[PDB]
Amino acid sequence: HKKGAGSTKNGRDSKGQRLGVKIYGDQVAKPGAIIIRQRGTKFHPGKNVGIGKDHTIFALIDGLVKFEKYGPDKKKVSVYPREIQPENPNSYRARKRENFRLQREKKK
């Protein structure tokens, strides 16, 4: 009734190395910000963009990230600064942060 249990020859792994897209498409970046840790060139380097020893793709300039279409079934990544970025005190966020600030000041 009490038979022996056979050992395995498995049970080894490496904890997920945390690759993938760090800075997404149409998003803020920096000079030096790592955009993608990819194991090979899944995405390819575009304009304004360095490519490192590990095929790590990082931005050289400010601006928003762009994942372009390369030609025959591949992907690029370029970075573009943005011209004018308007802010209106009309809006809800602007209204509410000024309301909050004014409450803070009013209390103390």
């Binding site: 009734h1 038979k3 022996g4 249990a5 056979g6 050992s7 395995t8 498995n10």
Partner: protein, 135 residues
């Protein structure tokens, strides 16, 4: 015993049997056919035993075809043994059949006799099958 010939990997998961079988609905060879309703894990012993019993009632002529081939393995662990310590060896191979799938096809006998035959072949199997004429 319709066993697969040297597959990729030894042991594999159970998954499950959602959905209706869409593809194996059509009939190719036969004019009459046995079709499944409830999903099940059909061993090769059940297939072979259905094929034999259906063949016995062909008699004078008319050809029979099988349209389900097991592929998936199943392991029972070493009998009377505690939990854990790896998987077991695969005992038998099974066909994952879903609802509305062809199991056996037959042509070239009188509709009298085919229907009689598939009753036996239904009786050998673990599921509520049904008779279907189309081709």
């Amino acid at each position: 015993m319709l066993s697969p010939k040297r597959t990729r990997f030894r042991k594999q998961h159970r998954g499950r049997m959602k959905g209706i079988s869409y593809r194996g609905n059509r009939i190719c060879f036969g004019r009459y056919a046995l079709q499944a309703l409830e999903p099940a894990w059909i061993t090769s012993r059940q297939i072979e035993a259905g094929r034999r019993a259906m063949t016995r009632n062909a008699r004078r002529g008319g050809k029979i075809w099988v349209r389900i081939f097991p592929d998936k393995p199943v392991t029972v662990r070493p009998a009377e043994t505690r939990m854990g310590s790896g998987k077991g060896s695969p005992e038998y191979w099974v066909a994952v059949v879903k609802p509305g799938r062809i199991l056996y096809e037959i042509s070239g006998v009188a509709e009298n006799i085919a229907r009689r035959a598939v009753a036996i072949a239904a009786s050998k199997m673990p599921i509520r099958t049904q008779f279907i004429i189309s081709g």
